[model samples]
Structure formats: structure tokens, C-alpha cells
Target: MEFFGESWKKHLSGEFGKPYFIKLMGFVAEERKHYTVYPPPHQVFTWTQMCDIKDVKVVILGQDPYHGPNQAHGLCFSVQRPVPPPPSLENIYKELSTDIEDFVHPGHGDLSGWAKQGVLLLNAVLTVRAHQANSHKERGWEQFTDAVVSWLNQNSNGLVFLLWGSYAQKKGSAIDRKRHHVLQTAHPSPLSVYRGFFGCRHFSKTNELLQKSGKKPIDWKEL
Candidate 1:
């Protein structure tokens, strides 16, 4: 947990160098009530857990944290923010939930199949609220993304990178362009669902690709 420990230390020190700044930011976040504050090293996922995985067939990349509480659950993009569910996810979840049980809460369901087949659920920025508005364009998330890509390159063999949005795609493009097959799609937001965001039939396509290549399927669709 040293890497995890160090990351948070750096994050806190960067966000609040002065005691007053720490209090001020804490007060603002509390007033906004964006997320429940946990103790130091407040992470939903650990680098060590990720690094120790044996195989990875698919990587799901997402943006920052959700603005709500008790979500995130160490799984990327699973959180519901203050803002509503992105349209793409909303639409897909509405339709998918019809036949599949616990589609929205895969972690709670029998979703371990994905992990068994080596699917890595990752995020560009592991920490929440690392950026805000314009702050995203200039933040440490890019650096973290680089590290993620490096880790993926080392871990994944003959796997596809499911880049969910433009930001994720760009990050993928920058790192190991020759290693992983990057699949670009619109963000799973309400704005992009109709435009092929969550409609890519990713599960079917992934299974087909794996089977044709003589590899086992990575079960990403818990439903």
C-alpha cells in the first residue's frame, strides 16, 4: 500500500499546502457536500491490487469521480454524481436492466465473471475531485493516465482497450500506440448514447473477437 499511501499524500499536500487552504477547501467541499470525506489515503482502488492481476483482456477507462457519496466502489465509472447519469449509460441501463438483473450494480451481483476472465476496470484519474472545470485541462490526471497506460502495457497481452470517451482515447493514443488495440467510442453520457456511446455492442464484439482469436471471453456485461 505504499504506492497508494504516497499518491494520497502527494494529492493532499498539493491540494492543501497551507493549513488555511486545507480548511478552506475542506469547508467548500463540505458545503457543496460533493463527497463524504474519508480519512487520509481515501481511495476506492489500490495500485497493488491492479498490478497483481494475471491477465487483462479489456480495460474500461473513465473520467473523474462522481459527485455523490457511497459510490465509486473501487470500480471506475460506477458512481452516480450530483449530476444525473450520463445519457448513454442511462439509456443503456434502462434497456439492459429490463432483462438483466443487477445491471446497474454489477459489483453487488454475480459480476465476478469479468474478473475471472481478466477484465480490468480502470479510470484515468484514480482520485476524486482532482480536477474541476478548467482544472481538468491542467492537472495531474494526465500523469496518472500515463502510469495507467504503462501498467496496462506491462500487464495486458493481446487485449483491447475500450476507450469510452474522447479523453480516454486521447490518453490511449499517446501511450503505447503500438501495444494495445484502442476502440474509440463516445462517452457513455446521455448526450452520446444515441450516437453509439453505449450501443457499440461491446460485449458481443469482445466475445466474438476473443473466440475467433482462440482466447477466452472477458465477461464485462454482468447482466
Candidate 2:
């Protein structure tokens, strides 16, 4: 419940009492009773908990948590160590290797390190049924995430939005490009990587934009 720390807590606390959110919570509770869900309840908001709103310099949008066990820990495109990187994440690392000089593979998929460094790895839908991607779609999570995105758009400045894929690009349509950098490309999924993601060089571009905005550039090689 300590989502996004004390500052964001004040901004988003009212969501907990909204009827739609309450209904979604009840539905998820019932789902946990009868079926397995990826990401335990406490971990559903780990993205917010890990990267506070004040520290959010970059925003990466994901459709939902990975549906497989041990793969989703609230952060998008990240999995626990020892669990092999998902195909999309492997493609992401591949891009980084080529885009960032001297960037070595981290040998693991966990992205908590990035979150700690101000990357908001937010998934639009926070929970999903095991083995069923997007199972939790339209269950009130989108409304909550939309609010988060909009809040950042209006309240923050000099942020970077890396919107991959059509879904992610569309999700970020409301971002104020005048105030933030919006970089769009194909998703890193094997099926779409060649379309535009391969040479997008978004990682470097993200840091460049951050530096231009008087923010510390993200150490892309760190995680």
C-alpha cells in the first residue's frame, strides 16, 4: 500500500477509495482465491514503490506484467534473476549493446537497478492471470495507470517517454511532447524488432535528452 512513497501517496491515495478500483481489487482478490496470479498482491505496485514520482526521469510503458510465474515482479520487461530473459528483453539488451558503447550484457533480466536510478518501469495493467497475458486488461488498472501518466505529464518537466510498439505509442499519446521527450519505436518482440526497434537507438537518445534537460544521464550499462 506504500505505493510511490509519501509524495505520490498523497497524489494517488484517493484511487484506493474509488468504486471502480474497489471493484477491481475485489475481482483480483477473488481471482487469487481460485486461480494463480502473476506478481503477488504486494508486488503489483513495485514499479511505483521502487521509483518514486519525484525521481522519475524516464518512463517506459508496458502493456501488462508477464503472465508466467517468476517473470513478473510489477516492473515491466523485467524478471527475477536466474529466470532467463524473455525474448523481448533479450532484444532490448541487444539494442543496448549496439547503441551504447562498452555496454556489457548484465547476464540477468532484473531491472530493479534501473528503477532505482529513476526509470519508471510501469505496466499499464498491473496483474494478470498465470500464463495469460493481458488477462487483467480493462479491470480498472488502465484507468489508474492513465491517471499516473497524465499526472506526470502535467506535473513533471524534462521527462523522457520511451514508447515501444503500437500499443505503447498509443498509450503515451497524451504526453506533452513540448515538455517531455517521446521516443517511439516498434516493440522489441522478435516479430517486430526488425521493423524499427533494431536501429532506434532509444537508450542513447534517452540519455541525451536527459542531459539536455539538466538531468543526470542514465547509466544505461548499469542495468
Candidate 3:
């Protein structure tokens, strides 16, 4: 899909990938493949494949990519195919039933379709070292994605922004509250499931906000 509009595209075209490449080169090749495993390497800009920046209707702000080998292939809480979903994705699916009654678990962990439909599944820190979590933090990835969010806040008016935790919630500051849906609650990990993550009804609430904006509601059950 389109990376961002002309402004985002212009910024990303030349200077975007270079900074991230330089930072990852600081690590060894061992960290590149596995965390010792697949989904190998920095799939930092993979979300762009599933969505055009102009088409983004909702933003799911993830802190980091999954640490597992086959766990994080671009989209947050999503792998490419065949690898069973990790715990957090399971929790997200579990809450979908509560949020929307017709929602059925896809039984697989690929959310690319959502991206195609305008859900920008993005991580703050795009890639991590093998078997090492948060390896890519403080690197240039955060800076690039920060620009992504800021640009979106200014460009995609009336979009829905889902911030599931304190970390995610911080990105919502620049979003216009009167123009968009900015919903927040506890994280969906097993450690914090009961702290209001399930009942936040973010999916339905987002759709309601989309309707208010005269945009089409997302198909929460079509996965």
C-alpha cells in the first residue's frame, strides 16, 4: 500500500530506512535470524504492504514486535502464516467476543486482511534481536514510527486510534478528540487481562465513531 501521503512518502523515500539499517548493523548477524529463529530480520516497514497511509482508518499502536521467531511478521499480534498466535493476540481475540457478539476467532494469527481494509497495525519499535526482547528500542525505529503517528494525527482526521496500554496511550496526545475515536484501557496480555481490556469494546466503539464520521464501519467478523 502507499506508505503515507506525499509528505510521508517524501520523508520516507530517502532518509527513512537508512537510520534503521545503521542501528541494526550495530548488532551481530546472530540476532538477525532467529531471536535464533524465522520472521527473520527487520520487517520494520512491513505494515506498509498491508495498508496505504491515506487509507488508514484506525491505528493499533504496538510497543514492539514479538520476540519470537515466527511471531511478528509486520502487523502487531500477527505472524505471516502457520505459526500459532502468541498470548497477546489470543487475548485480543478473546475480547472480540465480548466487544462484538458476532465476532468469531479466526483460529489463525494473521491480521493482514485488517491492514488491507485500512487498519494500520504498527509497532513503535519495529524489530527486535533474536531471543532478546526490546533489543531495537532507543534505536532509530522509534523515531521513524513517531513521525508516522504524528503525521497520521495531522493527516488522517476522524480516524480511530486504539491505545491499549499506558505506552500506547501516550501516542494519542496529538489526536483530535473531537474528530477521532481514541480509546484506551489495560493491555491484553495474560498478566493484565482483567484490568478492563476485555470490556473496553474498542472494536464496536471504533465502528460507531467511524459511522459518526460518515465512513464505513469495519467488518470485525469478516476475518
Candidate 4:
């Protein structure tokens, strides 16, 4: 991972750290080398630097890195440029607009700003082939991710987990709800939004929960 710089070292030291995670990341580096993955090499661990691990106020869980060119920036549902947003992110924007009146749709994806605000936009699995959704599943990522969530369950107190959709909700069961806030609802996918995602009120509720925990409230409206 040195060629990609050493930001993930801190994560390995703690916060989502595990002996096997280093192996997993190394495997990704070797196998995906010369491969056209959705996100850039350095950005693959964007979640690690999405916010200070200790400053993580919220975790918005997603399934995988968007397997589209220019559409994945390590953080789930985030692109690196201002382009037409994908369906799920578009729906996410709609919800943000509803939850915070001052929130304006950025008119494009690129949610890096949210990450800077201590919003950990995490995907359950990272890396995928071009136009190949879930192609990398069962390739050693799930185990690493399980370890990540397990660590969060035990250590990150009063954190907010936004579990949208069945996949995220099911993955979220490992979170220690006794010590955190978990808002589970239908996914933001157009095919599933009617199942209840539209009114989930996650943005405001997340800030409320953070404030309740005596933490700094995120300016969710600030794109």
C-alpha cells in the first residue's frame, strides 16, 4: 500500500483494525494492480480519511463501490466530479432536500464534503470491475468488512448508522444499538424507495442524535 501512500496505517493501528485487514488490503493491491477498478488507488481507502476515525459521527452504509467509471470515489454513493448522479444518490439527494430545508441538491454527486463533516459514507465492500457489479464479491472483502463493523459495534459509542435498504439493514444487525443510533429503512434505489425511504428523516435525525450525544452537529445542509 506504500505506492498508494500510508493513510491506512492509522486505521490498521486501531479503529477498524485487524491483523487480517492488512492482508486483505495487500491482496487488493496485488490482484487489482493494472486492473481498472471503479475508484482510484489512493481513494480506495477514502473511508479511512473520510473523517478522523474517532470523529466519525455517522455511518451511511452502502453495498459496494459503484462499478461505474468516474462514479466511484471510495466513499459509497459518491463520485469525484459533478456529473449526473446515479439513481440511488439522486434519491439520497431528494431525502436530504426533504430533511433539511436549506439543503440544496448539489446537482451532481461528489459527496466528499459530507465525508469532511465526519459522515462516514461507507460501502460494505470496496472495489469492482468496470460495469461489473458485485464482481469482486466473495473475494475476501466481506470478511474484512465484517471485522470493520464488529469493531465499530464495540468501540464507537453513540454513533449513528444509516442503514438504507435491506442489504445495509441486514449488514447493520452487527452494530451495538445499545450504544448507538441505527436508523434502518428501505434502500434509496428507485425500485425500493416507495417501501419507506422517502420519509425516513435520516439527515435531521442523525444530527439530532449527535447533538443528543453531546457531539458536534453536522451541517448536513452544507453540500
TM-score of each: 0.63, 0.96, 0.86, 0.88
lDDT of 4: 0.79
Clashes of 4: 2
Q: For candidate 3, what is the lDDT?
A: 0.76
* Model 2 quality (TM-score): 0.96
lDDT of each: 0.52, 0.90, 0.76, 0.79
Question: Per-residue alpha-carbon lDDT of model 2 for 1-223, expressed as tens digits?
Answer: 6634676677887788999989998999999999999898778888877766888999999898888878999889998889999999999999999999889889999999899899999888889999987888999998999888988999899999999999888899989989999999998999999999999999999999999999999888777
Location of the lowest summed lDDT over 10 successive residues in candidate 1: 130-139
**Model 4: per-residue Cα lDDT over 22-45, one tens digit each:** 776776677577578767776777
Highest TM-score against the true fold, candidate: 2
lDDT of 1 by residue, 11-47 (tens): 3344345554455445535633664332123344543
Q: Name the candidate, 1 or 3, with the larger lDDT value.
A: 3
Query: Model 2, residue 70: what's the lDDT?
Result: 88
Lowest lDDT sum, 10 consecutive residues, model 3, at 33-42
Instruction: Give the clashing pairs for model 3.
Output: 34-37, 35-130, 35-131
Judged by whole-model lDDT over C-alpha atoms, candidate 1 comes out at 0.52
- Residue 94 error, candidate 4, Å: 0.8
After superposition of all CA atoms, the RMSD between model 4 and the true structure is: 2.8
Rate residue 217 of model 4 by lDDT.
87
